[PDB]
Design a protein around this ligand. Structure first.
Ligand SMILES: *[C@@H]1O[C@H](CO)[C@@H](O[C@@H]2O[C@H](CO)[C@@H](O[C@@H]3O[C@H](CO)[C@@H](O)[C@H](O)[C@@H]3O)[C@H](O)[C@H]2NC(C)=O)[C@H](O)[C@H]1NC(C)=O
Ligand SMILES: *[C@@H]1O[C@H](CO)[C@@H](O[C@@H]2O[C@H](CO)[C@@H](O[C@@H]3O[C@H](CO)[C@@H](O)[C@H](O)[C@@H]3O)[C@H](O)[C@H]2NC(C)=O)[C@H](O)[C@H]1NC(C)=O
Ligand SMILES: *[C@@H]1O[C@H](CO)[C@@H](O[C@@H]2O[C@H](CO)[C@@H](O)[C@H](O)[C@H]2NC(C)=O)[C@H](O)[C@H]1NC(C)=O
Ligand SMILES: CC(=O)N[C@H]1[C@H]([C@H](O)[C@H](O)CO)O[C@@](O)(C(=O)O)C[C@@H]1O
Ligand SMILES: *[C@@H]1O[C@H](CO)[C@@H](O)[C@H](O)[C@H]1NC(C)=O
Lengths: 321, 172
């Protein structure tokens, strides 16, 4: 009469299915999820500096639409644009809107430094009922609408060197009247012109007279352009009409700043990773929440689940029933 | 798996073993009993923890990127932006799929391997005093009281003590 010694391994009653090289489903004792598929629905306010645009696009904050004046000189890691945002100033377009939005978003700041431009022989600070500021007519805070003085609009010719050690961003524009009567009434000359240049490059814009669709009391338009002036370069502005002049420049930076479209509310919590759906944890290597992300995030994948086996093959006792 | 212990020559697992992943069951004159083997259990867990920590190692931090949703039809530039993002997502989705498949195949094989390691270690310990039945059990050909079984399990079984007793019982 001897003894038996049996070697064996554990099993559990309720195993988990995983994928392998040879099996699309095989049962193991345990596994762990590698795809983050849920969000709180809220953008955590730490540790990134979140700036809620509320009713304002970044570009309207940049130009200084009156209802966006609260954004003056603001900074952000992530600027959040809401679907309820609206414009409420002079109607405008930006050729290459997307690029201007991108470069400002990335710069992370709207710090504006006023400069003493001398506009000899024109009327400054023009405004419109399309852009009310308090009870009276107004305009974009960062732009200076120039019009005739007396019965003349001379050739404007001004210069502003960059003697600083940082790049300057200048936002300027061109006014497109709806009628010839409007053009000559405002600028005397029957056709205007705006030329903005540095040493290396130049932009010249000819205004186009004509009706566009009526927006807030006007068929006319402004087109917005921009020019970056590097240290040691010089800005020159030359115009015989239709100039919407800069009042100064925006200070540019580089760093981690960006912009995101989202309607998720901002809440008191801590999360490195932000999506338009809200913040998500980043303990998992993959996520299926949104391909748009900001911060330290899992990588976006199409699968909604992927299970990493964390245990042996599960083999329960041969079943009597 | 590759070693053929788990779901192989060992018919099934033990739901009763809650204190370990691998271990021993015995029958002797004094009754039956069960004990986890801490060493093999730990070797498997350490390897699995190792791979888990390699997989969840934070590597990706991105800030300003490209736009990925668009409110207007634009044509060429937008086609390219979308194609770039879609290409990225598919390549990453493939990597995720392959990673888990390889990892899981390997986890099944290494756990099967540890079972087999414990089995071969036990057989070598018993020398000529036992025989492999073929189902994960050794028939031991001598009186092995509870103290002797614990000696097998904690690595202190001297085979010379019981060899003559066992050799005689085996060769008929
Ligand atoms: C088998 O694997 C699963 C994972 O699929 C394990 O479930 C997880 O168990 C841990 C406990 O170690 C739970 O962690 C929790 O973390 C929170 C937040 O930091 C903490 O406050 C809790 O105290 C807790 O530790 C986690 O909730 C749970 N996850 C899921 C999805 O169920 C399970 O423990 C493993 N089982 C075995 C037997 O190894
Ligand atoms: C419009 O305004 C600009 C800026 O004030 C005028 O450009 C300037 O033109 C003068 C020539 O009349 C340039 O003078 C030169 O300066 C160098 C020193 O760098 C000197 O060595 C030369 O002998 C010469 O005198 C001046 O550099 C230039 N300024 C810039 C920034 O380029 C332009 O002439 C004005 N035109 C009109 C029609 O008003
Ligand atoms: C996060 O938001 C995205 C984008 O809004 C959601 O995906 C959209 O909504 C449904 C989901 O079934 C789809 O039919 C749309 O095609 C999706 N749009 C895009 C642009 O992908 C997504 O479901 C949300 N995820 C979570 C976890 O909230
Ligand atoms: C600088 C200036 O005098 N602007 C005037 C404008 C412009 O003529 C047009 O907006 C050009 O398209 O017209 C107004 O009726 C307006 O818009 O409220 C009155 C305003 O005083
Ligand atoms: C913006 O910043 C500049 C310099 O830092 C300052 O001169 C200017 O007045 C600021 N404006 C506001 C509205 O804070």
């Amino acid at each position: 009469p001897g003894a038996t010694l049996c070697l064996g391994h554990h099993a559990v009653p309720n195993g988990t299915l995983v994928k392998t090289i040879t099996d699309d489903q095989i049962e193991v004792t345990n596994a762990t999820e590698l795809v983050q598929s849920s969000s709180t629905g809220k953008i955590c306010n730490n540790p990134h500096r979140i700036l809620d645009g509320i009713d304002c696009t970044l570009i309207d904050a940049l130009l200084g639409d009156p209802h966006c004046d609260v954004f003056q000189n603001e900074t952000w890691d992530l600027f959040v644009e809401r679907s309820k945002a609206f414009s409420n100033c002079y109607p405008y377009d930006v050729p290459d809107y997307a690029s201007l939005r991108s470069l400002v978003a990335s710069s992370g700041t709207l710090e504006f430094i006023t400069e003493g431009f001398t506009w000899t022989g024109v009327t400054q600070n023009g405004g419109s009922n399309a852009c009310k500021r308090g009870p009276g007519s107004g305009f974009f805070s960062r732009l200076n609408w120039l019009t005739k003085s007396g019965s003349t609009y001379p050739v404007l010719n001004v210069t502003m060197p960059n003697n600083d050690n940082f790049d300057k961003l200048y936002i300027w524009g061109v006014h497109h009247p709806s009628t010839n009567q409007e053009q000559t009434s405002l600028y005397v000359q029957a056709s205007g012109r705006v030329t903005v240049s540095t040493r290396r490059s130049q932009q010249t814009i000819i205004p186009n007279i004509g009706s566009r669709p009526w927006v807030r009391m006007t068929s006319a338009r402004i087109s917005i352009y921009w020019t970056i002036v590097k240290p040691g370069d010089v800005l020159v502005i030359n115009s015989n009409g239709n100039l919407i002049a800069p009042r100064g420049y925006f200070k540019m930076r580089t760093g981690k700043s960006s912009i995101m479209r989202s309607d998720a509310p901002i809440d008191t919590c801590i999360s490195e990773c932000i999506t338009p759906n809200g913040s998500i944890p980043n303990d998992k290597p993959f996520q299926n929440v949104n391909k748009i992300t900001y911060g330290a995030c899992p990588k976006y994948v199409k699968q909604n689940t992927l299970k990493l086996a964390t245990g042996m093959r599960n083999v329960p006792e041969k079943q009597t029933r | 798996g590759l070693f053929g212990a788990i779901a192989g020559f060992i018919e099934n697992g033990w739901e009763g073993m809650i204190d370990g992943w691998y271990g021993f069951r015995h029958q002797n004159s004094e009754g039956t009993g069960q004990a986890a083997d801490l060493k093999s259990t730990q070797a498997a867990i350490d390897q699995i923890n190792g791979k888990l920590n390699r997989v969840i190692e934070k590597t990706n931090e991105k800030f300003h990127q490209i736009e990925k949703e668009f409110s207007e039809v634009e044509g060429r530039i937008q086609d390219l932006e979308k194609y770039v993002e879609d290409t990225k997502i598919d390549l990453w989705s493939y990597n995720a799929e392959l990673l888990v498949a390889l990892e899981n195949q390997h986890t099944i094989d290494l756990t099967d391997s540890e079972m087999n390691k414990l089995f071969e270690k036990t057989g070598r310990q018993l020398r000529e005093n036992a025989e492999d039945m073929g189902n994960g059990c050794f028939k031991i050909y001598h009186k092995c009281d509870n103290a002797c079984i614990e000696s097998i399990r904690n690595g202190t079984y001297d085979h010379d003590v019981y060899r003559d007793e066992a050799l005689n019982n085996r060769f008929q």
